[PDB]
Design a protein around this nucleic acid. Structure first.
Ligand SMILES: [K+]
Ligand SMILES: [K+]
Ligand SMILES: [K+]
Ligand SMILES: [K+]
Ligand SMILES: [Mg+2]
Ligand SMILES: [Mg+2]
Ligand SMILES: [Mg+2]
Ligand SMILES: [Mg+2]
Ligand SMILES: [Mg+2]
Ligand SMILES: [Mg+2]
Ligand SMILES: [Mg+2]
Lengths: 140, 252, 119
RNA sequence: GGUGGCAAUGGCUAACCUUUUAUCUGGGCAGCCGAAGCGAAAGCAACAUGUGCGCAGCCUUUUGGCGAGGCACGACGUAU
RNA sequence: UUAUGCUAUCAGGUGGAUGGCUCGGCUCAAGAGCUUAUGAAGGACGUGCCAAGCUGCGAUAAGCCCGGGGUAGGUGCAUGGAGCCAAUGAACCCGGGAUUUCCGAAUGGGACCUCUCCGUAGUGAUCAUUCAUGAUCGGGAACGCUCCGAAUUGAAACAUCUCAGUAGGAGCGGGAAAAGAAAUCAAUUGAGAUGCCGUAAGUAACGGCGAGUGAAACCGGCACAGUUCAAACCGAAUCCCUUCGGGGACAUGUGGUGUUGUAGGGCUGUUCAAACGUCUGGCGGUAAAAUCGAACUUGCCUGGAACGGCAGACCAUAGAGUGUGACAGUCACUUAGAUGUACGCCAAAAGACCGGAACAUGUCCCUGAGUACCGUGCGUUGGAUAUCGUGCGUGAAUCUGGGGGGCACCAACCUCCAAAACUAAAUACUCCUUGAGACCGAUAGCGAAAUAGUAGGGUGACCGAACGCUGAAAAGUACCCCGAGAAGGGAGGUGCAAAGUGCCUGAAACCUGAUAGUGAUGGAACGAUACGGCAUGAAAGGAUCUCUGGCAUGAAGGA
């Protein structure tokens, strides 16, 4: 706190001088009392008692990097000028493997001919790419 | 935009196009941040020893003796160890484990450096900063200033450029400061006069080194605190041709 | 001798205060006269008991005399004619700092003195 | 929170190297946060705006119009 | 003359604040890093011409000898007397020696005896070797390794948990230590010793699933380094001591070979030729005290004294700083920059030496046991049926082999080869050295600005202070008077100034006196406000300001 502003206040913003003694003025140390007197506070701060679900091992579980077809479509020219994609007879050839993405999702619009090769596609990504005139290629 | 270059006699003998570092807007707030961060990163840990005032076995007498409940020596009534006891520990002293370093992002530190470099071109900022000079800013010197090896040659160049008055101001303005700094080793309060920036390591570093208030550095070793001593921009600086050439993408 | 290793006043004064005797010899240096500096190649030499010096600072500026005595611990010399008359009236020498005087004639009864002054 | 740098083609680097004696300059993409959520998990995976009201501001015949942000819907992803 | 008192100021005393100064402290960084039976550290006692403490030294005793550096003085903290030493080169510093009492690992025996007994003169204890000899012991600020191991506390009680493998203990031990060359980590296919740092991440995991506790791998860096045995085959082909005669070890195996995973090695045959390493060598670097190092001590003024002011003259690869009678680039030491250096340390050219690497063939040989594993108990761990340890019990296999891949087993795939050994660097620490500092500035900063772990306190384990400062120079007050005076006072001196020795400045409380006001008929939060008496009102405050009136305009109000 601003120590200088409280020089002369005696209690220094604490109320009574009998405040500010120990953990008794906080109701205990840490997040104690979450079943008894900090029960509602535990609900508010998310520390309510209980267990839920199970964790799978990190060595089998995996998350996939994603990119929506709108993001690919409306910055594909930047990808070609940066080298990560090429234009073959007018069709953008994007390989998500060198982008670090493994699943194409279907959010957005596809306005150009995208020939996209990726480890996985959502169904909607499939229709949006194929209706734009392009195709989807799985990574063997 | 463009700046004239003066030979060692002080006469303009050509033109140089100033890099984009020189048309950067004036940002005293960012300059202040950069200089304060560098000063803080220079600082040194300090504090009392680990158990200073606390290496006693003093314990309280308790109630029933007509005395305060402070800890006392086991074989005397002399109070010990408490911050309001004589010889007791300092409550809340400086800690050697305290971290005084400040971070400034490299982008905004470079922005501050560019702002301070552009501030060396404004006559109003430089004269308001304290400097005495009669030249036309910015001062770009031909590269032969870098090859001169004696202080007398630097004096002749600075006099031909109308900059030596600032050096004399720094020399005669050197004053013994007030207070405890003299005993700690900061006997004088020094002034800053002239910044010479060279293209690379040359004899002009040693040659101009001993001038009073003068800093001579290269473009690589150029930072915010040299260009804005005390967080104030507007340092009177002499750039060389090589320095201006080497400043094209220096902080952008 | 105190290098630029330490620019701190405390270390400088500690070095001077606890200087060994062979270092306190160099503290007795004094400026040589123009003739002596020309004919020795050095700017200064240690004041020795016997050589003639001219006092150039203090209450006795301009006096020329021979060094009567040198104290290495005090870093003072005693010069003929530089005295303090005391309440008895007897005349007592007033010690001088060697940096306040100038050597005008060297005592060269010691064959080692020439190399002592330089090299 | 106030003040700033940069900004989805994002931000910042950590250790460390460069110190020519702690600053500093230039490097350093490892990593972290943001960028997609929902689900215990398997897994699957969304609007670059479809509509309305309407503040500021602008235009205006001074009563209306357009209306970023805001508000209210509609639609969609996923769990149940 | 109102006493005893009260209030304010002043003078003085007491006191030691404040200010200024500081050879001390503290913190951080960079270095450097073991020592002792050839008797250490530590302690006791002694040691000085006058010497009590501390410091140094040891009956040769604030010291002795030699070489180098230094050179004219020296005789510690600590300028007193009287001497002594020193140009036969002292003092001092660097290197190397000598002396070195008693106790102490203490070690011929014994210690409420720092001494004492035998004197056969001293290898005390435990060990290795042939029995010549050798090793170990104690100490070291922290750091390191091994083992033993609480409670307060938190959970708002408390028991698992936490505190915490903390505190504390025992052993070992070096400049570092430990670890260390996969029976590894991965995952569909990869990497490739260890340590340390960053991150993963407060994630996985544990948990009255409460409070809390809590990784690793991958990845980015620092620094990089690999190898030696046991065995197969050979069989004394070896190693050690030595008085150089010989002696000891050794067939229960010295030595050679060999050293490992898509196996390696041996044995048989063929080919290529020999890399790493050890020793010598000292080009040259590092390297003692230390040496040299520019340029003013010019005029006037002020002053006790210029480093100041005003003129003038200069140096700068040197304007870091400190000292010097006040502020110094040019007075001194320095600095920047160059030199030199005994013993040492690293060290390239060039020589001497054991030797290295591929392939073919395989009813061939070898490849670590109370071990790995498992059962059960306990500790520990994030380790969860899936941490590590170790108590008890049980207990394999041998390349057609064995282990691992987070419950067990089966199968597939991937991966390695334990139960033997060593191994630089990167890392840690701070007794010590150097440097630095938005650190402290004498009730602070270390307890200690050190006659400080001291005085002093405690039977003991142990607890533990206070104390800095004359002045430029002692010029440290002559002579005289009083006084019992080697006290003190007066007078008189010194000094710019008494600053007159625990002496710079010199606050307040407190005490003595003086001055102003008041005061022996008087009522108490010691004041605020208004008006008066007395005193003061030099500076720093007013001068159409103060006093006293007139005139004009005058709000609210209004006789
Ligand atoms: K509690
Ligand atoms: K309780
Ligand atoms: K002087
Ligand atoms: K000075
Ligand atoms: Mg030991
Ligand atoms: Mg509790
Ligand atoms: Mg090992
Ligand atoms: Mg734990
Ligand atoms: Mg200098
Ligand atoms: Mg103290
Ligand atoms: Mg202290």
């Amino acid at each position: 706190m601003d120590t200088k502003k409280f020089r002369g206040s005696r209690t220094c913003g604490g109320g009574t001088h009998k405040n500010r003694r120990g953990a008794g003025n906080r109701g205990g140390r840490g997040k104690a009392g979450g079943c008894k007197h900090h029960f509602v506070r535990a609900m508010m701060r998310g520390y309510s008692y209980g267990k839920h679900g199970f964790k799978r091992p990190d060595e089998v579980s995996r998350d996939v990097s994603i990119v929506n077809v709108g993001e690919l479509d409306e910055l594909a020219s930047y990808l070609v000028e940066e080298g990560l994609a090429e234009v073959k007879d007018g069709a953008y050839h994007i390989n998500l493997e060198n982008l670090g993405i493994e699943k194409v999702l279907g959010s957005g619009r596809v306005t150009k001919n995208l020939v996209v090769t990726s480890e996985e596609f959502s169904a909607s990504a499939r229709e949006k790419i194929e209706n734009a005139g392009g195709s989807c290629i799985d990574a063997e | 935009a463009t700046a004239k270059t003066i030979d060692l006699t002080g006469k303009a003998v050509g033109e140089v196009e100033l890099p984009a570092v020189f048309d950067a807007d004036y940002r005293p707030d960012l300059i202040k941040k950069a200089v304060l961060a560098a000063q803080a990163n220079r600082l040194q840990p300090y504090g009392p020893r680990l158990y200073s005032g606390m290496e006693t076995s003093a314990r309280g007498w308790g109630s029933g003796r007509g005395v305060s409940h402070v800890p006392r020596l086991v074989n005397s009534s002399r109070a010990a160890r408490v911050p309001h006891a004589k010889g007791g520990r300092r409550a809340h002293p400086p800690k050697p484990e305290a971290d005084r370093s400040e971070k400034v992002n490299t982008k905004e530190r470079r922005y501050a450096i560019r702002s301070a470099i552009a501030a060396t071109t404004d006559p109003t900022l430089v004269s308001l900063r304290g400097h005495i000079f009669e030249a036309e800013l910015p001062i770009v010197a031909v590269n032969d200033l870098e090859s001169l090896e004696r202080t007398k040659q630097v004096i002749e160049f600075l006099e031909a450029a109308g900059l030596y008055e600032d050096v004399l101001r720094a020399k005669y303005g050197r004053h013994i400061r007030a207070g405890r700094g003299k005993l700690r080793g900061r006997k004088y309060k020094h002034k800053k006069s002239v910044l010479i920036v060279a293209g690379e390591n040359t004899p002009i570093l040693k040659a101009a080194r001993n001038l009073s208030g003068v800093d001579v550095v290269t473009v690589d070793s150029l930072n915010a605190e040299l260009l804005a001593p005390g967080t104030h921009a507007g340092r009177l600086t002499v750039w060389t041709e090589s320095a201006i050439g080497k400043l094209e993408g220096a902080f952008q | 001798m105190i290098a630029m290793v330490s620019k701190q006043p405390r270390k400088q004064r500690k070095a001077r205060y606890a200087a060994p005797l062979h270092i306190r010899q160099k503290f007795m240096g004094a400026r040589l006269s123009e003739a002596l500096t020309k004919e020795y190649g050095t700017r200064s030499a240690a004041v020795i008991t016997g050589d003639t010096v001219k006092v150039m600072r203090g209450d006795f500026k301009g006096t020329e005399g021979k060094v009567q005595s040198v104290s290495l611990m005090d870093g003072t010399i005693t010069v003929d004619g530089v005295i303090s008359t005391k309440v008895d009236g007897t005349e007592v020498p007033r010690p001088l700092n060697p940096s306040n005087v100038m050597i005008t004639k060297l005592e060269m009864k010691d064959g080692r003195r020439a190399s002592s002054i330089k090299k």
